[PDB]
Amino acid sequence: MIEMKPHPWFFGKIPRAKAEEMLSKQRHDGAFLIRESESAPGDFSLSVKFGNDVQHFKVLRDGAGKYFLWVVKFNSLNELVDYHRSTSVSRNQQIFLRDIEQ
Amino acid sequence: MKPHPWFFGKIPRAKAEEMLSKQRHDGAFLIRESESAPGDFSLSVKFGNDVQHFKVLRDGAGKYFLWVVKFNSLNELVDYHRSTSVSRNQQIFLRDIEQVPQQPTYVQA
Amino acid sequence: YVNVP
Amino acid sequence: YVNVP
Ligand SMILES: [Cl-]
Ligand SMILES: [Cl-]
């Protein structure tokens, strides 16, 4: 109806290691979050649970200000996230984004 | 641990104003993805009977800033401004938005 | 904007 | 990272 709520996937500047610890405890593949990278100041990183590991994707931004990971460009971070709920977040393996439980 | 309560994504500036004008404390804020400047962030904050907006500037090394001091993340920019005024003009300290179940604000789909 | 024109 | 070196 669209109730204005902060995005549940944003955790700010949590370490890459701390993101892995959290996501390794999740039950489903695809459980994710977006954090502000420590190693690369100014870049956001998308962290995702995948079996017994956690994969990280750099969130890129072009000159027109659109967000992307691969080829398809997005007008917002939430549109990027939603798209990757039905299309794989990876061109290598089939991984669909799903919200973190609890 | 816990997701932040202040990152709202791409919401209209007017809707940021509609939401914050219902908060009771000055300093209640949010960071949103700007519509007027794609790829940039804006910080909106309640201040009396108005809502002030701050443009989050970026330098060549990707740092974020409002005035002179630069930050490596929005998280650090936000946390610093909880103790030091977010503005060089008036004294306004950032504080988390309070849940108001009886007063929801809606954006379009 | 408070900080820029 | 998966998408960039
Ligand atoms: Cl400063
Ligand atoms: Cl100041």
Cα A22 from Cα A3, distance rounded (Å):
27
Hey, which chains touch A, using 3+ CB pairs under 8 Å? B, D
From the list B9, B37, B75, the residue facing A7 with the nearest CB is: B9
Cα B88 from Cα B74, distance rounded (Å):
18
DSSP conformation letters of B18-84? HHHTT-SSTTBEEEEE-SSSTT-EEEEEEETTEEEEEEEEE-TT--EESSSSEESSHHHHHHHTTTS
CATH code for the domain in which residue B6 is found? 3.30.505.10
Sign of the alpha-carbon torsion through A52, A59, B27, B78: positive
Contact A23, A16 (CB under 8 A): no
| Total number of domains in chain B | 1
Minimal C-alpha gap between D5 and chain A (Å): 10
- Which conformational region is residue B22 in: left (phi greater than 0), alpha (psi within -120 to 50 degrees), or beta? alpha
What's the domain range around A7? 1-102
Cα A35 from Cα B43, distance rounded (Å):
18
The alpha carbon of A24 is separated from its chain's Cα centroid by a whole number of angstroms, namely 15
Q: Is B103 helix (H, G, I), strand (E, B) or coil?
A: coil
Contact A32, A44 (CB under 8 A): no
Contact A97, A30 (CB under 8 A): yes
Cα B92 from Cα B95, distance rounded (Å):
9
Helix (H) or strand (E) holding A24: helix A16-24
Surrounding residues of ion ligand 2, Cβ less than 5 A: B 85
The answer for residues whose C-beta is within 8 angstroms of residue A59's C-beta and 6 or more apart is A34, A43, A44, A45, A46, A67, A68, A69, A77, A80
Cα B48 from Cα B24, distance rounded (Å):
9
Resolution of this entry in Å? 2.0
Residue B10 identity (one-letter amino acid): K
* Among the listed residues B75, B74, B94, the one whose alpha carbon sits nearest the alpha carbon of residue B84: B94
Cα B74 from Cα B69, distance rounded (Å):
13
CB neighbours of residue B100 within 10 Å: 12
Q: Cα of B85 to ligand 1 centre, how many Å?
A: 9
Q: Are strands A53-61 and A67-68 parallel, antiparallel or unpaired?
A: antiparallel
Rg (C-alpha) for chain D, rounded Å, is: 4
For B67-81, letters b (16+ CB in 10 Å) and e give eeebbbbbbbbbeeb
Take residue A12 and report the two structure tokens written for it: 């700010």
- State the maximum Cα–Cα separation within chain C, in Å, rounded to a whole number: 8
Take residue B95 and report the two structure tokens written for it: 């504080």
CB contact under 8 A, B89 and C2: yes
* Among the listed residues A80, A72, A83, the one whose alpha carbon sits nearest the alpha carbon of residue A44: A80
Rg (C-alpha) for chain A, rounded Å, is: 13
Residue A4 identity (one-letter amino acid): M
The alpha carbon of B87 is separated from its chain's Cα centroid by a whole number of angstroms, namely 12
